[PDB]
Structure formats: structure tokens, C-alpha cells
Short mmCIF file of C-alpha atoms in Angstrom, two decimals:
data_model
loop_
_atom_site.label_atom_id
_atom_site.label_comp_id
_atom_site.label_asym_id
_atom_site.label_seq_id
_atom_site.Cartn_x
_atom_site.Cartn_y
_atom_site.Cartn_z
CA UNK A 1 -18.96 9.79 -21.91
CA UNK A 2 -16.87 11.33 -24.72
CA UNK A 3 -13.42 9.99 -25.59
CA UNK A 4 -10.61 11.70 -27.46
CA UNK A 5 -7.67 9.43 -28.26
CA UNK A 6 -4.17 10.72 -29.04
CA UNK A 7 -1.33 8.79 -30.66
CA UNK A 8 1.94 10.08 -29.20
CA UNK A 9 5.62 9.20 -29.45
CA UNK A 10 6.66 7.06 -26.50
CA UNK A 11 8.94 8.35 -23.76
CA UNK A 12 10.48 5.27 -22.13
CA UNK A 13 11.16 5.48 -18.39
CA UNK A 14 11.28 1.77 -17.47
CA UNK A 15 14.91 1.66 -16.30
CA UNK A 16 14.26 4.74 -14.15
CA UNK A 17 11.07 3.24 -12.70
CA UNK A 18 12.98 0.07 -11.76
CA UNK A 19 15.80 2.13 -10.25
CA UNK A 20 13.45 4.00 -7.90
CA UNK A 21 11.63 0.74 -7.13
CA UNK A 22 14.92 -0.85 -6.11
CA UNK A 23 15.93 2.16 -4.00
CA UNK A 24 12.52 1.85 -2.27
CA UNK A 25 13.19 -1.84 -1.52
CA UNK A 26 16.58 -0.86 -0.04
CA UNK A 27 15.07 1.86 2.14
CA UNK A 28 12.37 -0.57 3.25
CA UNK A 29 15.00 -3.04 4.40
CA UNK A 30 16.93 -0.30 6.22
CA UNK A 31 13.65 0.36 8.03
CA UNK A 32 13.26 -3.37 8.74
CA UNK A 33 16.58 -3.24 10.59
CA UNK A 34 15.30 -0.23 12.53
CA UNK A 35 12.18 -2.25 13.45
CA UNK A 36 14.64 -4.69 15.08
CA UNK A 37 16.56 -2.00 16.97
CA UNK A 38 19.49 -2.25 14.55
CA UNK A 39 20.08 1.41 13.81
CA UNK A 40 23.75 0.92 12.91
CA UNK A 41 22.94 -1.39 10.02
CA UNK A 42 19.84 0.60 9.03
CA UNK A 43 22.04 3.68 8.77
CA UNK A 44 24.75 1.95 6.75
CA UNK A 45 22.21 0.71 4.20
CA UNK A 46 20.64 4.17 4.00
CA UNK A 47 24.00 5.86 3.37
CA UNK A 48 24.86 3.49 0.52
CA UNK A 49 21.38 3.82 -0.99
CA UNK A 50 21.57 7.62 -0.90
CA UNK A 51 25.03 7.45 -2.47
CA UNK A 52 23.81 5.14 -5.25
CA UNK A 53 20.67 7.22 -5.85
CA UNK A 54 22.71 10.41 -6.26
CA UNK A 55 25.41 8.87 -8.47
CA UNK A 56 22.95 7.36 -10.97
CA UNK A 57 20.68 10.44 -10.94
CA UNK A 58 12.84 19.18 -16.05
CA UNK A 59 9.39 19.69 -14.49
CA UNK A 60 8.98 19.87 -10.79
CA UNK A 61 5.81 18.98 -8.87
CA UNK A 62 3.91 21.57 -6.90
CA UNK A 63 5.07 22.23 -3.34
CA UNK A 64 1.91 20.57 -2.02
CA UNK A 65 2.80 17.35 -3.86
CA UNK A 66 6.36 17.47 -2.45
CA UNK A 67 4.98 17.74 1.07
CA UNK A 68 2.41 14.96 0.56
CA UNK A 69 5.30 12.67 -0.36
CA UNK A 70 7.54 13.80 2.50
CA UNK A 71 4.68 13.26 4.97
CA UNK A 72 4.53 9.66 3.73
CA UNK A 73 8.28 9.24 4.21
CA UNK A 74 8.07 10.57 7.75
CA UNK A 75 5.19 8.17 8.38
CA UNK A 76 7.34 5.25 7.27
CA UNK A 77 10.17 6.32 9.57
CA UNK A 78 7.87 6.84 12.57
CA UNK A 79 6.17 3.46 12.07
CA UNK A 80 9.51 1.65 11.89
CA UNK A 81 10.87 3.55 14.92
CA UNK A 82 7.70 2.73 16.89
CA UNK A 83 8.06 -1.01 16.36
CA UNK A 84 11.80 -1.06 17.03
CA UNK A 85 11.83 1.17 20.14
CA UNK A 86 8.26 1.35 21.49
CA UNK A 87 9.11 -1.10 24.26
CA UNK A 88 11.41 1.49 25.87
CA UNK A 89 11.08 4.91 24.19
CA UNK A 90 7.35 5.67 24.04
CA UNK A 91 7.96 9.09 25.62
CA UNK A 92 10.21 10.24 22.80
CA UNK A 93 8.14 8.48 20.11
CA UNK A 94 5.01 10.29 21.28
CA UNK A 95 6.84 13.61 20.90
CA UNK A 96 7.89 12.67 17.37
CA UNK A 97 4.31 11.75 16.43
CA UNK A 98 3.00 14.99 17.97
CA UNK A 99 5.38 16.92 15.71
CA UNK A 100 4.09 15.01 12.69
CA UNK A 101 0.56 16.04 13.70
CA UNK A 102 1.72 19.68 13.65
CA UNK A 103 3.17 19.03 10.19
CA UNK A 104 -0.23 17.87 8.90
CA UNK A 105 -1.90 20.91 10.48
CA UNK A 106 0.59 23.21 8.72
CA UNK A 107 0.10 21.27 5.49
CA UNK A 108 -3.69 21.70 5.79
CA UNK A 109 -3.24 25.49 6.10
CA UNK A 110 -0.97 25.38 3.01
CA UNK A 111 1.95 26.64 5.15
CA UNK A 112 4.44 24.26 3.56
CA UNK A 113 7.47 25.92 5.17
CA UNK A 114 6.02 25.22 8.62
CA UNK A 115 5.15 21.68 7.48
CA UNK A 116 8.74 20.97 6.41
CA UNK A 117 10.08 22.48 9.65
CA UNK A 118 7.74 20.42 11.80
CA UNK A 119 8.74 17.25 9.93
CA UNK A 120 12.46 17.94 10.46
CA UNK A 121 11.63 18.44 14.13
CA UNK A 122 9.85 15.07 14.23
CA UNK A 123 12.86 13.26 12.76
CA UNK A 124 15.31 15.05 15.06
CA UNK A 125 13.32 13.93 18.09
CA UNK A 126 13.83 10.29 17.06
CA UNK A 127 17.57 10.73 17.77
CA UNK A 128 16.56 10.21 21.41
CA UNK A 129 15.58 6.58 20.81
CA UNK A 130 19.16 5.57 19.85
CA UNK A 131 21.47 8.41 20.92
CA UNK A 132 24.66 6.55 19.95
CA UNK A 133 23.24 6.23 16.42
CA UNK A 134 22.02 9.74 15.66
CA UNK A 135 23.93 9.96 12.37
CA UNK A 136 22.22 6.76 11.24
CA UNK A 137 18.77 8.11 12.16
CA UNK A 138 19.56 11.35 10.33
CA UNK A 139 20.62 9.39 7.25
CA UNK A 140 17.37 7.43 7.31
CA UNK A 141 15.39 10.68 7.29
CA UNK A 142 17.50 12.16 4.48
CA UNK A 143 16.92 9.01 2.42
CA UNK A 144 13.16 9.21 2.94
CA UNK A 145 13.20 12.88 1.91
CA UNK A 146 15.38 12.04 -1.10
CA UNK A 147 13.12 9.18 -2.25
CA UNK A 148 10.01 11.31 -1.76
CA UNK A 149 11.40 14.05 -4.01
CA UNK A 150 12.65 11.51 -6.54
CA UNK A 151 9.29 9.73 -6.80
CA UNK A 152 7.37 13.00 -7.05
CA UNK A 153 9.57 14.17 -9.93
CA UNK A 154 9.06 10.88 -11.77
CA UNK A 155 5.31 10.88 -11.15
CA UNK A 156 5.12 14.50 -12.32
CA UNK A 157 7.10 13.87 -15.53
CA UNK A 158 5.16 10.67 -16.26
CA UNK A 159 2.01 12.70 -16.98
CA UNK A 160 3.49 16.10 -17.79
CA UNK A 161 5.34 14.83 -20.86
CA UNK A 162 2.18 13.48 -22.59
CA UNK A 163 0.04 16.42 -21.46
CA UNK A 164 2.56 18.78 -23.03
CA UNK A 165 2.45 16.79 -26.27
CA UNK A 166 -1.37 16.89 -26.33
CA UNK A 167 -1.45 20.57 -25.45
CA UNK A 168 1.01 21.34 -28.25
CA UNK A 169 -1.01 19.26 -30.73
CA UNK A 170 -4.27 20.99 -29.79
CA UNK A 171 -2.53 24.39 -29.89
CA UNK A 172 -1.41 23.66 -33.46
CA UNK A 173 -4.83 22.33 -34.52
CA UNK A 174 -6.84 25.20 -33.02
CA UNK A 175 -4.67 28.29 -33.46
CA UNK A 176 -2.09 27.18 -36.07
CA UNK A 177 0.80 28.43 -33.92
CA UNK B 1 -3.76 4.22 -10.41
CA UNK B 2 -0.64 4.50 -12.55
CA UNK B 3 -2.51 4.33 -15.88
CA UNK B 4 -5.12 6.99 -15.07
CA UNK B 5 -4.91 10.57 -13.87
CA UNK B 6 -7.64 13.05 -13.04
CA UNK B 7 -7.70 16.66 -14.11
CA UNK B 8 -8.44 18.77 -11.03
CA UNK B 9 -9.24 22.22 -12.41
CA UNK B 10 -12.68 22.50 -10.77
CA UNK B 11 -10.89 23.54 -7.53
CA UNK B 12 -13.96 22.42 -5.57
CA UNK B 13 -13.10 18.85 -6.58
CA UNK B 14 -9.48 19.65 -5.74
CA UNK B 15 -10.54 20.79 -2.27
CA UNK B 16 -12.83 17.79 -1.77
CA UNK B 17 -10.05 15.34 -2.62
CA UNK B 18 -7.49 17.09 -0.40
CA UNK B 19 -10.02 17.15 2.45
CA UNK B 20 -10.44 13.38 2.23
CA UNK B 21 -6.70 12.77 1.93
CA UNK B 22 -6.06 15.01 4.94
CA UNK B 23 -8.70 13.31 7.08
CA UNK B 24 -6.91 10.07 6.16
CA UNK B 25 -3.58 11.51 7.40
CA UNK B 26 -5.34 12.57 10.63
CA UNK B 27 -6.73 9.07 11.19
CA UNK B 28 -3.32 7.57 10.46
CA UNK B 29 -1.75 9.77 13.13
CA UNK B 30 -4.45 8.84 15.64
CA UNK B 31 -3.58 5.21 14.93
CA UNK B 32 0.10 6.08 15.44
CA UNK B 33 -0.77 7.24 18.97
CA UNK B 34 -2.68 3.99 19.49
CA UNK B 35 0.49 2.13 18.41
CA UNK B 36 2.20 3.89 21.33
CA UNK B 37 -0.57 3.02 23.78
CA UNK B 38 -1.96 6.58 23.85
CA UNK B 39 -5.61 5.70 23.42
CA UNK B 40 -6.80 8.96 24.99
CA UNK B 41 -5.10 11.18 22.41
CA UNK B 42 -5.90 8.73 19.60
CA UNK B 43 -9.59 9.03 20.47
CA UNK B 44 -9.51 12.82 20.88
CA UNK B 45 -8.06 13.15 17.37
CA UNK B 46 -10.55 10.67 15.92
CA UNK B 47 -13.52 12.59 17.32
CA UNK B 48 -12.27 15.96 16.09
CA UNK B 49 -11.63 14.45 12.67
CA UNK B 50 -15.08 12.82 12.45
CA UNK B 51 -16.80 16.03 13.54
CA UNK B 52 -14.97 18.19 11.01
CA UNK B 53 -15.39 15.65 8.21
CA UNK B 54 -19.14 15.41 8.77
CA UNK B 55 -19.62 19.18 9.01
CA UNK B 56 -17.64 19.89 5.84
CA UNK B 57 -19.58 17.21 3.98
CA UNK B 58 -22.95 18.74 4.90
CA UNK B 59 -25.03 19.79 1.91
CA UNK B 60 -22.67 18.09 -0.55
CA UNK B 61 -24.03 4.96 -5.05
CA UNK B 62 -21.30 2.35 -4.57
CA UNK B 63 -22.26 -1.30 -4.28
CA UNK B 64 -22.42 -2.97 -0.89
CA UNK B 65 -19.40 -5.07 -1.91
CA UNK B 66 -17.40 -1.89 -2.58
CA UNK B 67 -18.36 -0.36 0.75
CA UNK B 68 -17.35 -3.52 2.59
CA UNK B 69 -14.02 -3.87 0.82
CA UNK B 70 -13.17 -0.40 2.12
CA UNK B 71 -14.53 -1.10 5.58
CA UNK B 72 -12.48 -4.31 5.81
CA UNK B 73 -9.37 -2.23 5.13
CA UNK B 74 -10.36 0.24 7.84
CA UNK B 75 -10.82 -2.61 10.31
CA UNK B 76 -7.42 -3.94 9.22
CA UNK B 77 -5.77 -0.60 10.00
CA UNK B 78 -7.34 -0.45 13.46
CA UNK B 79 -6.42 -4.03 14.32
CA UNK B 80 -2.83 -3.56 13.20
CA UNK B 81 -2.39 -0.39 15.26
CA UNK B 82 -3.96 -1.97 18.35
CA UNK B 83 -1.72 -5.02 17.96
CA UNK B 84 1.45 -2.90 18.00
CA UNK B 85 0.25 -0.73 20.88
CA UNK B 86 -1.19 -3.46 23.08
CA UNK B 87 0.21 -6.81 21.92
CA UNK B 88 2.66 -6.89 24.82
CA UNK B 89 -0.23 -7.07 27.30
CA UNK B 90 -3.55 -7.94 25.59
CA UNK B 91 -2.93 -10.69 23.07
CA UNK B 92 -5.93 -12.59 24.43
CA UNK B 93 -8.38 -9.82 23.55
CA UNK B 94 -6.63 -8.96 20.28
CA UNK B 95 -6.90 -12.58 19.16
CA UNK B 96 -10.67 -12.47 19.71
CA UNK B 97 -10.95 -9.30 17.63
CA UNK B 98 -8.98 -10.82 14.73
CA UNK B 99 -11.16 -13.95 14.87
CA UNK B 100 -14.16 -11.70 14.28
CA UNK B 101 -12.42 -10.03 11.33
CA UNK B 102 -11.86 -13.54 9.88
CA UNK B 103 -15.60 -14.17 10.22
CA UNK B 104 -16.30 -10.89 8.42
CA UNK B 105 -14.09 -11.90 5.49
CA UNK B 106 -15.96 -15.22 5.30
CA UNK B 107 -19.28 -13.35 5.18
CA UNK B 108 -17.87 -10.99 2.57
CA UNK B 109 -16.73 -13.92 0.42
CA UNK B 110 -20.25 -15.38 0.70
CA UNK B 111 -21.57 -11.95 -0.37
CA UNK B 112 -23.52 -11.74 2.91
CA UNK B 113 -22.58 -8.09 3.35
CA UNK B 114 -24.99 -7.46 6.24
CA UNK B 115 -23.36 -10.25 8.25
CA UNK B 116 -19.94 -8.90 7.24
CA UNK B 117 -20.72 -5.42 8.55
CA UNK B 118 -22.07 -6.81 11.83
CA UNK B 119 -19.03 -9.05 12.34
CA UNK B 120 -16.72 -6.06 11.83
CA UNK B 121 -18.58 -4.10 14.52
CA UNK B 122 -18.11 -7.09 16.81
CA UNK B 123 -14.38 -7.14 16.05
CA UNK B 124 -14.06 -3.44 16.93
CA UNK B 125 -16.21 -3.84 20.07
CA UNK B 126 -14.00 -6.68 21.31
CA UNK B 127 -11.01 -4.29 21.04
CA UNK B 128 -12.37 -2.39 24.07
CA UNK B 129 -10.68 -4.94 26.33
CA UNK B 130 -7.17 -3.73 25.50
CA UNK B 131 -7.97 -0.37 27.16
CA UNK B 132 -11.11 -0.62 29.33
CA UNK B 133 -10.91 2.98 30.53
CA UNK B 134 -10.73 4.23 26.92
CA UNK B 135 -13.58 2.28 25.35
CA UNK B 136 -15.22 5.43 23.96
CA UNK B 137 -11.93 6.40 22.34
CA UNK B 138 -11.67 2.97 20.69
CA UNK B 139 -15.24 3.21 19.39
CA UNK B 140 -14.44 6.67 18.04
CA UNK B 141 -11.49 5.33 16.07
CA UNK B 142 -13.68 2.64 14.50
CA UNK B 143 -16.41 5.13 13.58
CA UNK B 144 -13.79 7.30 11.86
CA UNK B 145 -12.50 4.32 9.86
CA UNK B 146 -16.05 3.47 8.74
CA UNK B 147 -16.76 7.12 7.91
CA UNK B 148 -13.56 7.42 5.89
CA UNK B 149 -14.28 4.20 3.98
CA UNK B 150 -17.80 5.41 3.13
CA UNK B 151 -16.58 8.82 1.98
CA UNK B 152 -13.74 7.40 -0.13
CA UNK B 153 -16.05 4.96 -1.92
CA UNK B 154 -18.42 7.84 -2.72
CA UNK B 155 -15.59 10.05 -4.02
CA UNK B 156 -14.27 7.05 -5.95
CA UNK B 157 -17.74 6.58 -7.45
CA UNK B 158 -18.01 10.24 -8.54
CA UNK B 159 -14.77 9.54 -10.43
CA UNK B 160 -16.25 8.51 -13.80
CA UNK B 161 -17.98 11.89 -14.06
CA UNK B 162 -14.71 13.91 -13.83
CA UNK B 163 -12.49 14.59 -16.88
CA UNK B 164 -9.54 12.22 -16.97
CA UNK B 165 -6.56 10.95 -18.92
CA UNK B 166 -5.71 7.31 -19.42
CA UNK B 167 -2.79 5.56 -21.05
CA UNK B 168 -3.57 2.39 -23.02
CA UNK B 169 -1.40 -0.69 -22.67
CA UNK B 170 0.16 -1.60 -26.00
CA UNK B 171 -0.29 -5.33 -26.67
CA UNK B 172 0.97 -5.20 -30.28
CA UNK B 173 1.98 -2.72 -32.97
CA UNK B 174 -1.75 -2.19 -33.70
CA UNK B 175 -3.53 -3.42 -30.56
CA UNK B 176 -4.09 -1.61 -27.24
CA UNK B 177 -6.05 -2.20 -24.02
CA UNK B 178 -7.62 0.15 -21.50
CA UNK C 1 -5.28 4.50 -40.25
CA UNK C 2 -8.81 3.85 -39.02
CA UNK C 3 -9.42 3.00 -35.37
CA UNK C 4 -11.82 0.36 -34.04
CA UNK C 5 -12.51 -0.68 -30.46
CA UNK C 6 -13.81 -4.07 -29.35
CA UNK C 7 -15.79 -3.70 -26.12
CA UNK C 8 -15.71 -6.89 -24.06
CA UNK C 9 -17.14 -7.83 -20.66
CA UNK C 10 -14.57 -9.97 -18.83
CA UNK C 11 -16.67 -11.37 -16.00
CA UNK C 12 -14.34 -14.37 -15.64
CA UNK C 13 -11.22 -12.18 -15.37
CA UNK C 14 -12.91 -10.04 -12.70
CA UNK C 15 -13.87 -13.17 -10.76
CA UNK C 16 -10.27 -14.40 -10.96
CA UNK C 17 -9.06 -11.04 -9.65
CA UNK C 18 -11.52 -11.08 -6.74
CA UNK C 19 -10.43 -14.63 -5.85
CA UNK C 20 -6.84 -13.39 -5.55
CA UNK C 21 -7.95 -10.29 -3.64
CA UNK C 22 -9.85 -12.45 -1.16
CA UNK C 23 -6.89 -14.81 -0.78
CA UNK C 24 -4.85 -11.69 0.03
CA UNK C 25 -7.35 -10.89 2.79
CA UNK C 26 -7.03 -14.43 4.17
CA UNK C 27 -3.24 -14.35 4.01
CA UNK C 28 -3.23 -10.96 5.77
CA UNK C 29 -5.35 -12.29 8.62
CA UNK C 30 -2.99 -15.27 9.00
CA UNK C 31 -0.21 -12.68 9.32
CA UNK C 32 -2.31 -10.80 11.88
CA UNK C 33 -2.33 -13.93 14.03
CA UNK C 34 1.45 -14.17 13.65
CA UNK C 35 1.75 -10.55 14.82
CA UNK C 36 0.08 -11.72 18.05
CA UNK C 37 2.43 -14.68 18.54
CA UNK C 38 -0.36 -17.07 17.45
CA UNK C 39 1.69 -19.18 15.05
CA UNK C 40 -0.60 -22.21 15.36
CA UNK C 41 -3.65 -20.35 14.05
CA UNK C 42 -1.59 -18.43 11.46
CA UNK C 43 -0.37 -21.68 9.89
CA UNK C 44 -3.83 -23.23 10.05
CA UNK C 45 -5.32 -20.37 8.01
CA UNK C 46 -2.34 -20.49 5.64
CA UNK C 47 -2.85 -24.23 5.02
CA UNK C 48 -6.59 -23.75 4.51
CA UNK C 49 -6.04 -20.80 2.18
CA UNK C 50 -3.40 -22.65 0.15
CA UNK C 51 -5.73 -25.63 -0.24
CA UNK C 52 -8.61 -23.45 -1.43
CA UNK C 53 -6.29 -21.62 -3.83
CA UNK C 54 -5.08 -24.95 -5.27
CA UNK C 55 -8.59 -26.33 -5.81
CA UNK C 56 -9.66 -23.11 -7.57
CA UNK C 57 4.34 -20.11 -17.25
CA UNK C 58 4.82 -16.86 -15.33
CA UNK C 59 7.36 -14.18 -16.16
CA UNK C 60 10.40 -14.52 -13.91
CA UNK C 61 10.97 -10.85 -13.02
CA UNK C 62 7.28 -10.34 -12.12
CA UNK C 63 7.15 -13.46 -9.96
CA UNK C 64 10.37 -12.40 -8.19
CA UNK C 65 9.06 -8.92 -7.44
CA UNK C 66 5.94 -10.54 -5.99
CA UNK C 67 8.00 -12.97 -3.92
CA UNK C 68 10.10 -10.14 -2.48
CA UNK C 69 6.90 -8.35 -1.44
CA UNK C 70 5.57 -11.52 0.15
CA UNK C 71 8.82 -11.96 2.09
CA UNK C 72 8.54 -8.37 3.29
CA UNK C 73 5.02 -8.96 4.62
CA UNK C 74 6.18 -12.09 6.46
CA UNK C 75 9.26 -10.39 7.97
CA UNK C 76 7.15 -7.43 9.09
CA UNK C 77 4.52 -9.61 10.76
CA UNK C 78 7.22 -11.73 12.43
CA UNK C 79 9.07 -8.67 13.69
CA UNK C 80 5.91 -7.44 15.42
CA UNK C 81 4.96 -10.84 16.84
CA UNK C 82 8.42 -11.90 18.03
CA UNK C 83 10.74 -8.91 17.93
CA UNK C 84 10.63 -8.59 21.73
CA UNK C 85 12.59 -11.85 22.23
CA UNK C 86 13.96 -13.12 18.87
CA UNK C 87 15.81 -10.13 17.43
CA UNK C 88 18.99 -12.11 16.70
CA UNK C 89 17.17 -14.55 14.45
CA UNK C 90 15.09 -11.83 12.78
CA UNK C 91 18.19 -9.75 12.02
CA UNK C 92 19.71 -12.72 10.19
CA UNK C 93 16.49 -13.11 8.22
CA UNK C 94 16.53 -9.46 7.17
CA UNK C 95 20.19 -9.79 6.12
CA UNK C 96 19.12 -12.53 3.71
CA UNK C 97 16.34 -10.40 2.26
CA UNK C 98 19.00 -7.72 1.60
CA UNK C 99 21.09 -10.33 -0.25
CA UNK C 100 17.98 -11.28 -2.22
CA UNK C 101 17.40 -7.67 -3.30
CA UNK C 102 21.03 -7.33 -4.42
CA UNK C 103 20.80 -10.55 -6.44
CA UNK C 104 17.45 -9.37 -7.86
CA UNK C 105 18.98 -6.04 -8.93
CA UNK C 106 21.63 -7.99 -10.87
CA UNK C 107 18.93 -10.27 -12.33
CA UNK C 108 20.65 -13.22 -10.65
CA UNK C 109 17.27 -14.77 -9.94
CA UNK C 110 18.61 -18.17 -8.81
CA UNK C 111 20.60 -16.42 -6.05
CA UNK C 112 17.64 -14.13 -5.28
CA UNK C 113 15.27 -17.11 -4.90
CA UNK C 114 17.78 -18.98 -2.73
CA UNK C 115 18.29 -15.96 -0.45
CA UNK C 116 14.53 -15.43 -0.02
CA UNK C 117 14.02 -19.06 0.97
CA UNK C 118 16.95 -18.72 3.39
CA UNK C 119 15.42 -15.58 4.86
CA UNK C 120 12.06 -17.30 5.42
CA UNK C 121 13.71 -20.44 6.83
CA UNK C 122 15.57 -18.36 9.41
CA UNK C 123 12.20 -17.01 10.58
CA UNK C 124 11.34 -20.51 11.76
CA UNK C 125 13.69 -19.89 14.66
CA UNK C 126 11.32 -17.40 16.29
CA UNK C 127 8.86 -20.18 17.19
CA UNK C 128 10.84 -23.43 17.19
CA UNK C 129 7.81 -25.70 17.80
CA UNK C 130 5.83 -23.98 15.03
CA UNK C 131 8.31 -23.98 12.18
CA UNK C 132 5.87 -25.99 10.05
CA UNK C 133 3.34 -23.16 10.42
CA UNK C 134 5.92 -20.50 9.54
CA UNK C 135 6.96 -22.50 6.49
CA UNK C 136 3.29 -22.68 5.55
CA UNK C 137 2.98 -18.90 5.69
CA UNK C 138 5.95 -18.55 3.31
CA UNK C 139 4.60 -21.18 0.90
CA UNK C 140 1.32 -19.26 0.77
CA UNK C 141 3.10 -15.99 -0.04
CA UNK C 142 5.06 -17.73 -2.83
CA UNK C 143 1.89 -19.40 -4.15
CA UNK C 144 0.19 -15.98 -4.23
CA UNK C 145 3.14 -14.46 -6.07
CA UNK C 146 3.01 -17.33 -8.57
CA UNK C 147 -0.76 -16.89 -9.02
CA UNK C 148 -0.41 -13.14 -9.66
CA UNK C 149 2.44 -13.67 -12.12
CA UNK C 150 0.45 -16.42 -13.86
CA UNK C 151 -2.60 -14.13 -13.93
CA UNK C 152 -0.50 -11.29 -15.36
CA UNK C 153 1.04 -13.53 -18.03
CA UNK C 154 -2.38 -14.74 -19.25
CA UNK C 155 -4.00 -11.32 -18.83
CA UNK C 156 -4.24 -10.59 -22.57
CA UNK C 157 -4.43 -14.05 -24.10
CA UNK C 158 -7.73 -14.60 -22.25
CA UNK C 159 -9.70 -11.67 -23.78
CA UNK C 160 -7.90 -12.00 -27.12
CA UNK C 161 -9.07 -15.60 -27.46
CA UNK C 162 -12.60 -14.57 -26.48
CA UNK C 163 -12.60 -11.81 -29.13
CA UNK C 164 -11.14 -14.12 -31.71
CA UNK C 165 -13.92 -16.63 -31.02
CA UNK C 166 -16.67 -14.01 -31.19
CA UNK C 167 -15.33 -12.66 -34.50
CA UNK C 168 -15.10 -16.18 -35.91
CA UNK C 169 -18.70 -16.86 -34.90
CA UNK C 170 -20.01 -13.65 -36.48
CA UNK C 171 -17.97 -13.99 -39.66
CA UNK C 172 -18.51 -17.68 -40.46
CA UNK C 173 -21.40 -19.09 -38.40
CA UNK C 174 -24.17 -16.50 -38.89
#
């Protein structure tokens, strides 16, 4: 095809990339405890990870991108919950998955408010798998929502910053503005 | 990946990509029902998804190796879901299905892609034993995985034709790769 | 400030990549057997895959990231295959992976490597007559993380040496 190559000034994001990568490892291990029926420890890890992510932390993605990421976070939570509690709680887990199906239907219609509401419903239903650990399950869902938003903002800025530089260069070259 | 991004201004290529991603979410949720032993609902979703995906593709070439790499991943997804949903009761049947997947990977490594495709169909067929009243549902899930792998490889092939941005890796002050 | 591009066909690099991709498929199917409680067959495939990988200096941080991912795949397979009866052992193993991540975050890679080995060793307890097989699974995941880190380290020296050789040929032997 045809290639146009720009030389731009680097924006370094490595320490931020590693920080989100580490938060993702932490959330994964909280979910590994949930896969073993250990909601107390899963919740404690999630609370500390959320705390650390907020303490150490322009252009926002489109709402559709936010919901794509949050759907993935809900999927991770449901999959962990299903391994950890499917021996006993398939009734409640089926309800939670049904709600996630409604979230995808809303997402497909571009009704992102209904998508977000259905996803919150899905996570609330999981409280029924460990009713003495509902705060922990709620913290796991908050962490997944927080990591989804954080990754989407980093993925947005990763390409927005160079596209803005290119756009501004072409604007100067073509219109002398 | 993380070094490439595709401009999606054509809107019809936007809508085609979102349609494939959304059919993937649908198939994932059908597999989530299978992980809970709900083969009837898993199959109902798989058939609705296949029907809609085919209809919306109407009126709209990757190597055999590329097709099979994607189909192997679809088989992997189905096996993993069935193992969570039915491993407590049907490890005997699930073991047979995985053995057939192993044979498919051997055929794939030998570049015998016809044998690979056949061995994957045998793996999926053997899965019927975990839920003998829901054998049509289980075949519907496998067809959806194959259909999604075929569609994604096609969309991934029509990728070079679309405008795109790429970042080069800097090897030195004056030397880059892409 | 003129720009020149050398176009090179790296058939050997692609073949190396596919060899690692296929070994990933083999390792995954070993883990699939573990998810079904079939530790004997899992370890057999692991041993056979490690042998084939052997017949056919990494950066520390990259190898450690790969090892942590390998440990995650092993803990996830083991939780599915044995979580119904061996949760006490598996919980201890996950605790060690958490220690490994903390050490990794501090770039204390000796402590991270020790914790990961401890995590995998604790997994042995889920199938006490098959701990050789479970150890074999973990060795394969570490060998794969070493092979990917080695591949990444030599990713540019390979085509650079090929280019250097082609330029030398054209400049001095034509």
C-alpha cells in the first residue's frame, strides 16, 4: 500500500503500564481465592488493590469502549464465581449469568445505561453465593470496574496522543494554522 | 495488537467489527451456561447467535493453517467450559474429547489440516456423552465456535486493506522495526 | 535526514515463533488433563513436550513476568481439577503466588522466584502420588517462559546479523 511515516516526540508511559499490569495481577489473584471459595481473602486483596490504585492515580474513551471493558470485568468475576461456588450455588450463578446476557443485549442496542444497570444487577446477585461476604464480593466488582476504566483510559491515551500530534502537524502543513 | 490500531471511520467496517465482537460475547455467555450445566440454554443461545450471524453476513482468503489455529482455539473454549460444567460427573467422556484435541494438534503440527479438522469434529462429537439429552445443543455450540473462527480469520484477513497506524520499535537512535 | 528501509523475510524467526506457539498448545492440553484430575497423562505430555522443546541470556524482568503467567495457568488448572477436595492446599499455593507478585513489584526477583517455586511445590499436595507429574508441569511452564524470554532477547540480533551479512556480501563480494 502507501506508507506515511511521522517522527514524533516520545510520550513515555512505561511506569504506568507496569502499574496497571501489577494491579491486574493482584485482581487476578483475588479472583483465584474466589475460585477456591475464599471470599474473605479475595475481598481483602481487592480492597488493598483499589486503595493502591487510587492513591497512585485527559482524554476519555467513548462510552461503548467503557462498556466493552466492563463487560470483560464482569466476565472475569462470573467465571471465578462459577468455579468457586458452582458445586452449591448454580441457581444463583445462573441468575447472574442471565443478567450479563441482558447487559450484552443492551450493549448491542447501544443502550449503555441499561447495560451498566444490568451488569450491576449481575454482580449484586453474586452476593447470594457467599452471603456472609457480601462486602468482599462488592469490592471485587468495584475493582473490576475500576481496572476496566483505568485500562480504557490508558489504551485511549496511548493512541490519542500521537494521533493529536499527527493531526496538528498535518493541520500546520496543509492550512498553515 | 498493542503496536497497531485501525481507523474505523467507514462505519460499515465499524459495524462489522462490533457485530463479530458481539457474537463472540454471545458465544462466551452460552459457554458460561454450559459451565453451570445448563446445556439447554447454552444451545438455544448458540443457535440464535449462529442464525443471526449467518443472516447478517449474507451478501457481504486465509490459509488453512490460519483457519485451523482459530478453530483449535474454539475447540479449546468448548472443552474448557464443558470440563467446568460436567467434570464432577463425566470425566471419562471429557478425557476422550481432550485426547481427540491432542490428535488434532498433532495433525496441525504435521500440517495435515484436513486430518486436524476431522479430529476436532470427533472431539466435539465425543462431548455429547456429558449430556446425552442435549446432544443437539452441544453440536450447536461447536458449529458456532467454528463459524466464529472462520469469520474472525476473514475479518482479520481484510485487515491489510483498511487504513491503519503502527508504532515502530526503536532499536537504536537511528534504527527502527515494524 | 534521509530514511531507508531494509525489507527482510525472517522465515526462521517465524518458524521459531510457531514452534513456541505449538508448544503452548501442547502445554495447554496437558493442563486440560489436569483440569480433569488426570495428572498421569498431564505429566506425560509435559515430559514429552519438554523433551521436544529441548531437542529443538534472557532479560530477568521478562522471564519473571512469563513465569508468573505460567504459575497462574497451573494454579487455575489445578483449582478446576482438584478444588472440590484440596482447597486447603490450593489456598496455600495461591498465598505464595501473592508473595511472588509482591516481591516482583519490588524487583526482588530472588524472592519472587523462590515464592513461585514454593507455590508450585504446594500444588503437589493435591495429588500426592503424582507429584512428579505436577512438578513436570511447572518445569514446562518455566522452560516456556525461559524460551520466550530468550526469543525476545535475541529478537533483533537475529535479523540485524542477517542484514549485516547481506550488506557485506553486496558491498564487498559482488
